[PDB]
């Protein structure tokens, strides 16, 4: 009762699992867990849930959230662009170009 | 045969062809009055500044990148800074009486071959001791050349048109065979045209008249310009500078007549004495620069250049700021770039105080009918020991909460009473009359510290405090530069975000829209900030006015009640989230459709619970005859306001989109 | 930049340039000349800017015409597959006639 | 939440398109009729109440807004009932 | 605007600018120069329009 | 266009400013004809868009004439921005 869950949409928001979804859609377990964690983090960051720890939010990971870390593809691209510069180096355009 | 001419003269039949003849136009007008946020478009806006029009066409293109928008913002900020640093020289008051009319100002930019800008303000719109924001007008560049001696330029209105007089000076070399030098002076008149261009300046030879004035070396002659009521003549008079008005009473007034065809005649001394004696009080001493009125047959308006750099206009107890030192303090903020320009502390750069005075904080007591009455209005009045009438300094409605009101209290040059220097008293419906000791009295010592007189009675103030440590106040989003400040902090981010939206550069649009408002919050120096909205007038305006503005412009009505601008930002946030979800949904692979779902759910909890609206209610199906008489005042008396159909539509399109995400359809709903 | 350059030259021109027994030499018209140069430059730069915008709108209209063409090609491709399905039936019925 | 932030300008809203709303076409009929009912003096033959007496007794209802009756039946009903009157 | 600016400069140019033992210095052609500038500008603005 | 490359940058209010001394020639009459110079310190600053504002002339002829300079010698020019108070210290 401490969670005021009143309907199926509220249960979806709480358990982070879609219960109204049809059986046609099939997704891998790890991707589904990632989606649940992303939804929970998004709900916390917008303070829809009562009070996130302000110390934890101040971490760089949640500063970089919207820009890089909220989407898996952007995070992978950032991590490879850090680890594999040669892939994204284009001689035509370059930062700090004279 | 014959309609009642009285009935036809009603506004409803004046607005007939334009709005009321067609039901759709009438509904659109009524919603545009009641729901401004729907029709607010950041791209185009009435009363748009010329530099925001430079901005829009500069940023409007197919490809938008971070560097392009950064450079466009930098050019716009350059324009804003250039138009903000200019200082006023001189002014003219369009009306014989200071209560009504217009005042025209002349300002010089900080450049060597100076540019001159003319600004006009309306005194009719001024009320309650504060000039209305819409009363001020934006600066306009003067195209003709101006090259005055010692900034001897003075505007005048003639035949309801703006004219400029300035004195030019030039150097020539008399031969005496030793070679010697001397000057010549040419009064020049120009006027604006209907298309806002400037006519060619017409030279007038004043060398005789100035040579009659035995000027000091490198001293600018006192120039008085005034337009005569009735007769169309420019009075142009030259007078010698003196420290006191008492000396102008017998000054040998030079001048000349200038006529509509720009022929001229000299003044006769006998005429000049009369033109002097009627309006000697307007002449600028070596200690004061005054504003001229139209000629007539309770001091004048005045411009003081304070040592701290504030310029202000004074009339009796009232002072109003003219220039702003925001752009001179902004350079430090600009050294760290755009993210710092738009920050909250930037909007809290201090304005130096204007004139001599002090800051006092007044706390308004709660609603308490026995000490209040039924009408909730209250007015704060000031009085000064010249023992004129009192003057209103603030006006408001008594809340059930306290109100905290911080006021700059003017102090006169001279302490014309030894016991107290200002009186403030509180008036309201129950007790509108003043009492001799019945409010806070303030007095100043020689070191300049203000204290409350113990003889005065504070019973109907909840508290009075003097902020003796404070000599500045926050940047003003209602003053003269209010238009430019709303132009920069709110309009420019919204225009940029809107342009980036059409180019599907969602990542840049999110940050640009995040400048004005961000649900996640704001982090500064590694700490989360309490505030939610980055714009001060949106943060402070927390609920709509008791009545809206009646205006067929959505932007003036939203300016009167900036709670509407908050909704406009919210709605552009929903537009961004929906567009991002639609763009992800266009790819039908499994992984991307879950990003489409999390985008829609992100906007879904932002909208929140769709409102329930009980289908039938007290409305009783009344006759048209009786509904007419109920609605005829001496529609809200009988018809209720509907929820915004656009907000309802957002819930409809989001629910249908999630329905497709749940049922493995596409966006067109096809299996 | 051109406005500042021309205004600076104008201001620097009003000072006299001949000295001694002959004086003056300051061209009185220099401010009007600078205002004329900057105001005729303005027209050229606004024409260049409007031409950049019209180029941008051209590239956008062209891209929309590639939507018209791509969708037309996709529809013709899609209808060919069903034509093949119909011919597959017609051939099954011809084997059966045999 | 929108209602948690932007509700409360009105005590009680109503749905888009309902009869009771101040933007409904019924509200436009009432507002227009208030001004129109006075364009001629009562004694004039062109007076609206004399010219269209049944309109002044019109009920404002969701029924009268939703039911798309034929106009010609209403013109027949009006001429017929006035003939049965005279 | 350009026509007014050029006419104003032309009128301001006919006044002499050297004084004392040497006089004159007024460029006599300034009105024809201003009429030429405004009349060549006219062609450009009509092309833009 | 400085005399003897007498240009010295300074930062003021976190913005870049330039001081340079210009020099010009004039002919005093003594009826024999004679020549002499005049000196004009000029200040400019950069704008946010990287363009440069128009240089503003400052009359230094008295102050330089107080310095009994050698012939064709550039005066020592010291430029420094004050911490706290927003003033340019300009010293010759």
Q: What is the 3-state secondary structure (H, E, C) of B504-550?
A: CCHHHHHHHHHHHECCCCCEECCEECCCCECCHHHHHCCCCCCCCCC
Residue closest to B116 by CA, chosen among F46, E3, C35: C35
d(CA B549, CA B556) in angstroms, rounded, equals 8
Q: Which residues of B touch A39 (CB under 8 A)?
A: 598, 601
The set of chains that have 3 or more CB pairs under 8 A with D is: B
Q: Which residues of E touch C23 (CB under 8 A)?
A: 18-20
d(CA B247, CA B284) in angstroms, rounded, equals 12
Chain-chain contact of B144 with E5 (C-beta, under 8 angstroms) = yes
d(CA B220, CA B235) in angstroms, rounded, equals 19
Which residue on chain B is closest to E17 by alpha carbon? B172
Q: Is B301 exposed, middle or buried (0-12, 13-18, 19+ CB in 10 A)?
A: buried
User: What is the three-class DSSP state of B90?
Assistant: strand
Question: What's the number of CA atoms in the CB half-sphere (13 Å) around residue B227?
Answer: 20
* Residue B559 contacts residue B37 (beta carbons within 8 Å): no
User: What is the three-class DSSP state of B632?
Assistant: coil
- Angle formed at CA A47 by CA A42 and CA A53, multiple of 5 degrees: 95
Residue closest to F43 by CA, chosen among F85, F84, F77: F77
d(CA B564, CA B456) in angstroms, rounded, equals 43
Residue closest to B498 by CA, chosen among B512, B484, B488: B512
DSSP state, residue B451:
E
Find tokens 């204290």 and name the residue. B451
Instruction: Report resolution (Å) to 1 decimal.
Output: 3.2
Dihedral sign from CA coordinates of B664, B666, B670, B671: negative
| Element housing D64 (H / E) | helix D62-66
Chain-centroid distance, C-alpha B57: 25
Q: Which residues of D touch B541 (CB under 8 A)?
A: none
- Among candidates C21, C28, C40 on the partner chain, residue whose Cβ is nearest the Cβ of E12: C28
d(CA F57, CA C12) in angstroms, rounded, equals 9
What the block records as the tokens of C93 is 């019925």
Which residue on chain B is closest to E21 by alpha carbon? B175
What the block records as the tokens of B614 is 């009980």
Taking the Cβ of residue B77 and every Cβ of chain F, the question of whether any pair is shorter than 8 Å is answered with yes
What the block records as the tokens of B315 is 């009339």
- Among candidates B514, B595, B605 on the partner chain, residue whose Cβ is nearest the Cβ of A71: B595
Which residues in chain C (1-20) have CB-CB distances under 8 A to chain F? 1, 4, 7-8, 11, 19-20
What the block records as the tokens of B551 is 């205006």
Task: Report H helices in B324-412.
Answer: 326-334, 338-341
Taking the Cβ of residue B179 and every Cβ of chain C, the question of whether any pair is shorter than 8 Å is answered with yes
Question: How far away is chain D from the Cα of B579, in angstroms, using its nearest Cα?
Answer: 20
**Strands of B16-151, DSSP E:** 87-93, 102-108, 116-122, 140-141
Q: Which residues of B touch E4 (CB under 8 A)?
A: 143-144, 197-200
| Element housing B271 (H / E) | helix B269-278
- Angle formed at CA D23 by CA D18 and CA D29, multiple of 5 degrees: 95
d(CA B383, CA B390) in angstroms, rounded, equals 5
- Chains B, C: CB contacts within 8 A come to 44
User: What is the three-class DSSP state of D79?
Assistant: helix
Q: Is F51 exposed, middle or buried (0-12, 13-18, 19+ CB in 10 A)?
A: middle
Residue closest to B647 by CA, chosen among B618, B615, B606, B591: B606
Find tokens 């132009």 and name the residue. B487
Chain-chain contact of D59 with B641 (C-beta, under 8 angstroms) = no
The values of phi and psi at residue D62, to 5°, are -55, -35
- Angle formed at CA B278 by CA B275 and CA B279, multiple of 5 degrees: 85
- Quickly count: other Cβ atoms within 10 Å of residue B666's Cβ: 12
Chain-chain contact of B78 with F47 (C-beta, under 8 angstroms) = yes
Question: How far away is chain C from the Cα of E36, in angstroms, using its nearest Cα?
Answer: 13
| Alpha carbon distances (Å) from B214 to B205, B217, B240, B277, D43 | 17, 9, 8, 21, 83
* Residue D44 contacts residue B1 (beta carbons within 8 Å): yes
- Quickly count: other Cβ atoms within 10 Å of residue D32's Cβ: 17
User: What is the three-class DSSP state of B596?
Assistant: helix
Which residue on chain E is closest to B199 by alpha carbon? E4
**Strands of F5-81, DSSP E:** 7-12, 15-26, 36-45, 56-59, 78-81
d(CA A62, CA A55) in angstroms, rounded, equals 11
DSSP state, residue B345:
G
Helix B645-662, helix B563-585: angle, nearest 10 = 20
> Taking chain E, what is the end-to-end CA distance rounded to the nearest angstrom?
16
- Among candidates B511, B597, B605 on the partner chain, residue whose Cβ is nearest the Cβ of A43: B605
Find tokens 């790890």 and name the residue. A30
What the block records as the tokens of B489 is 């902090």
**Strands of B72-160, DSSP E:** 87-93, 102-108, 116-122, 140-141, 153-158
Residue closest to B45 by CA, chosen among B559, B569, B560: B559
Q: Which residues of D touch B11 (CB under 8 A)?
A: none
Chain-chain contact of C29 with E9 (C-beta, under 8 angstroms) = yes
Taking the Cβ of residue F54 and every Cβ of chain B, the question of whether any pair is shorter than 8 Å is answered with yes
- Percent helix, percent strand, percent coil in chain C, to nearest 5: 80, 5, 15
> Taking chain B, what is the end-to-end CA distance rounded to the nearest angstrom?
66
d(CA B208, CA B186) in angstroms, rounded, equals 11
Question: How far away is chain D from the Cα of B33, in angstroms, using its nearest Cα?
Answer: 12
> Taking chain A, what is the end-to-end CA distance rounded to the nearest angstrom?
64
- Among candidates B12, B609, B640 on the partner chain, residue whose Cβ is nearest the Cβ of D21: B640
* Residue F54 contacts residue C4 (beta carbons within 8 Å): yes
Helix B66-84, helix B50-59: angle, nearest 10 = 170
Residue closest to F3 by CA, chosen among F56, F51, F71: F71
The values of phi and psi at residue B406, to 5°, are -105, 120
B292-293 and B87-93 as β-strands: parallel, antiparallel, unpaired? parallel
Residue closest to B88 by CA, chosen among B293, B304, B287: B304
d(CA D16, CA D24) in angstroms, rounded, equals 8
Which residues in chain C (19-78) have CB-CB distances under 8 A to chain F? 19-21
d(CA F67, CA F62) in angstroms, rounded, equals 9
* Residue B153 contacts residue B164 (beta carbons within 8 Å): yes
What the block records as the tokens of F57 is 């002339």
Burial F64-81 (b: 16+ CB within 10 A, else e): beeeeeeeeeebebebeb
d(CA B497, CA C39) in angstroms, rounded, equals 32
DSSP B463-480: EEEE-TT--EEE--SSST
d(CA D51, CA C69) in angstroms, rounded, equals 61
Q: Which residues of A touch B520 (CB under 8 A)?
A: 45-46, 65-66
Chain-chain contact of D57 with B4 (C-beta, under 8 angstroms) = no
Chain-chain contact of F55 with B332 (C-beta, under 8 angstroms) = no
Cα torsion through B636, B642, B645, B647, rounded to 10: 110
- Angle formed at CA A14 by CA A8 and CA A16, multiple of 5 degrees: 95
Cα torsion through D4, D10, D16, D21, rounded to 10: 170
Which residue on chain E is closest to B172 by alpha carbon? E19
- Among candidates E1, E8, E20 on the partner chain, residue whose Cβ is nearest the Cβ of B145: E8
Which residue on chain F is closest to B114 by alpha carbon? F54
The values of phi and psi at residue B609, to 5°, are -65, 120
* Residue B233 contacts residue B223 (beta carbons within 8 Å): no
User: What is the three-class DSSP state of F31?
Assistant: coil
What the block records as the tokens of B637 is 């008396």
* Residue B257 contacts residue B267 (beta carbons within 8 Å): yes
Chain-chain contact of F29 with C7 (C-beta, under 8 angstroms) = no
* Residue B172 contacts residue B181 (beta carbons within 8 Å): yes
Method: cryo-EM
d(CA B509, CA B500) in angstroms, rounded, equals 5
The set of chains that have 3 or more CB pairs under 8 A with B is: A, C, D, E, F
Residue closest to B576 by CA, chosen among B479, B506, B476, B659: B506
d(CA F42, CA F2) in angstroms, rounded, equals 9
Chain-centroid distance, C-alpha B441: 32
Chain-chain contact of D30 with B631 (C-beta, under 8 angstroms) = yes
DSSP state, residue F33:
B
d(CA F2, CA E39) in angstroms, rounded, equals 40
Taking the Cβ of residue B175 and every Cβ of chain E, the question of whether any pair is shorter than 8 Å is answered with yes
The values of phi and psi at residue E47, to 5°, are -65, -40
Question: What are B236's strand-pairing partners?
Answer: B225, B256
User: What is the three-class DSSP state of C70?
Assistant: helix
């Amino acid at each position: 009762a401490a969670a005021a869950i009143k309907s199926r949409d509220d249960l979806y928001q709480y358990l982070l699992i879609d219960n109204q979804v049809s059986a046609a859609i099939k997704t891998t377990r790890i991707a589904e867990a990632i989606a649940s964690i992303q939804l929970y983090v998004n709900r916390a960051l917008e303070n829809v849930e009562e009070n996130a720890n302000s110390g934890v939010i101040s971490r760089q990971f949640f500063i970089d959230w919207d820009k890089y870390n909220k989407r898996y593809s952007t995070w992978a691209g950032v991590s490879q662009l850090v680890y594999y510069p040669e892939n994204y180096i284009d001689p035509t355009m370059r930062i700090g170009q004279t | 045969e014959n309609a009642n001419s009285g009935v036809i003269s009603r506004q409803f039949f004046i607005d007939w062809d334009k709005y009321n003849k067609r039901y759709s136009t009438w509904a659109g007008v009524s919603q545009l009055v009641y729901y401004p946020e729907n029709y607010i478009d950041p791209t185009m806006r009435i009363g748009q500044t010329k530099m925001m029009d430079a901005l829009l066409q500069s940023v409007s293109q197919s490809q938008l990148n971070a560097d392009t928008v950064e450079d466009a913002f930098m050019s716009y900020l350059t324009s804003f800074e250039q138009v903000a640093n200019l200082k006023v020289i001189s002014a003219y008051h369009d009306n014989i009486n200071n209560d009504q009319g217009l005042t025209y100002f002349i300002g010089l930019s900080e450049t060597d071959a100076g540019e001159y800008y003319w600004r006009s303000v309306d005194h009719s719109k001024f009320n309650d001791g504060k000039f209305a924001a819409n009363a001020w007008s934006e600066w306009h560049k003067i195209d003709c050349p101006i090259n005055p001696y010692k900034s001897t330029i003075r505007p005048v209105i003639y035949k309801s048109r703006l004219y400029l007089l300035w004195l030019e000076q030039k150097e020539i070399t008399k031969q005496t065979y030793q070679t010697e030098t001397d000057y010549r002076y040419e009064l020049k008149l120009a006027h604006i045209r209907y298309d806002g261009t400037w006519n060619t300046p017409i030279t007038f030879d004043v060398n005789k008249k100035i040579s009659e004035l035995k000027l000091e070396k490198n001293r600018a002659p006192g120039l008085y310009c005034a337009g005569y009521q009735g007769e169309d003549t420019l009075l142009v008079m030259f007078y010698n500078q003196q420290d006191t008005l008492d000396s102008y009473k017998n000054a040998s007034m030079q001048g000349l007549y200038i006529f509509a065809d720009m022929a001229s005649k000299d003044m006769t001394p006998e005429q000049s004495n009369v033109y002097r004696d009627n309006s000697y009080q307007q002449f600028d001493t070596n200690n004061v620069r005054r504003v001229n009125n139209r000629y007539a047959e309770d001091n004048a308006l005045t411009l003081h250049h304070n040592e701290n750099g504030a310029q202000y206009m004074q009339w009796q107890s009232y002072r109003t700021r003219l220039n702003t030192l925001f752009a001179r303090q902004l350079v430090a903020r600009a050294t760290t770039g755009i993210d710092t320009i738009l920050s909250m502390e930037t909007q809290n750069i201090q304005e130096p105080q204007l004139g001599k005075g002090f800051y006092a904080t007044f706390v308004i007591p709660p609603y308490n009918l026995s000490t209040h009455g039924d009408e909730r209005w209250f007015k704060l009045y000031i009085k000064h020991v010249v023992d004129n009438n009192s003057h209103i300094i603030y006006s408001g409605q008594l809340t059930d909460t306290n109100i905290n009101i911080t006021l700059f209290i003017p102090l006169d040059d001279v302490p014309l009473n030894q016991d107290y220097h200002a009186k403030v008293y509180m008036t309201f419906k129950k007790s509108p009359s003043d009492g001799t000791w019945w409010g806070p009295h303030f007095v100043r010592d020689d070191k300049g510290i203000v204290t409350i007189n113990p003889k005065s009675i504070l019973t109907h103030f909840e508290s009075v405090n003097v902020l003796n440590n404070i000599s500045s106040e926050p940047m003003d989003f209602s003053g003269a530069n209010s238009l430019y400040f709303w132009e920069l902090f709110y309009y420019t981010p919204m225009l940029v975000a809107q342009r980036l939206l059409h180019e599907q550069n969602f990542d840049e649009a999110n940050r640009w829209l995040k400048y004005v408002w961000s649900p996640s919050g704001y982090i500064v120096h590694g700490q989360i900030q309490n505030y939610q909205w980055n714009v001060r007038p949106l943060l402070e305006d927390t609920s709509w006015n008791s009545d809206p503005l009646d205006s067929v412009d959505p932007d003036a009505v939203a300016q009167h009640d900036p709670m509407h601008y908050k909704v406009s930002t919210f709605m552009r946030t929903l537009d961004l989230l929906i567009a991002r979800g639609d763009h992800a949904y266009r790819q039908l692979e499994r992984d991307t459709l879950n990003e489409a779902k999390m985008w829609y759910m992100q906007a879904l909890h932002l909208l929140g619970d769709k409102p329930y609206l009980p289908l039938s209610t007290t409305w009783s199906d009344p006759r048209l005859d009786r509904a007419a008489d109920i609605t005829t005042q001496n529609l809200t008396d009988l018809f209720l306001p509907q929820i915004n159909e656009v907000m309802m539509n957002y819930w409809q399109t989001l629910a249908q989109r999630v329905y497709n995400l749940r049922h493995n359809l596409s966006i067109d709903g096809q299996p | 930049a051109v406005q500042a350059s021309r205004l600076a030259g104008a201001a620097a021109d009003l000072v006299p340039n001949i000295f001694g027994f002959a004086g003056g030499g300051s061209r009185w018209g220099a401010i009007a000349e600078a205002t004329g140069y900057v105001m005729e430059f303005s027209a050229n730069v606004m024409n260049t800017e409007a031409d950049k915008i019209s180029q941008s709108e051209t590239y956008r209209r062209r891209r929309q015409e590639w939507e018209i063409q791509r969708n037309n090609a996709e529809a013709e491709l899609k209808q060919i597959d069903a034509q093949l399905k119909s011919l597959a039936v017609r051939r099954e019925a011809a084997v059966l006639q045999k | 939440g929108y209602n948690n932030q932007f509700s409360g300008r009105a005590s009680q809203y109503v749905a888009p398109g309902t009869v009771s709303s101040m933007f409904s076409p019924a509200a436009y009929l009432t507002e227009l009729y208030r001004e129109a009912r006075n364009l001629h003096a009562s004694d004039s033959v062109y007076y609206l109440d004399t010219r269209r007496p049944d309109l002044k007794s019109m009920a404002l209802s969701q029924q009268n807004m939703d039911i798309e009756l034929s106009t010609l039946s209403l013109s027949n009903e009006l001429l017929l009932e006035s003939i049965k009157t005279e």
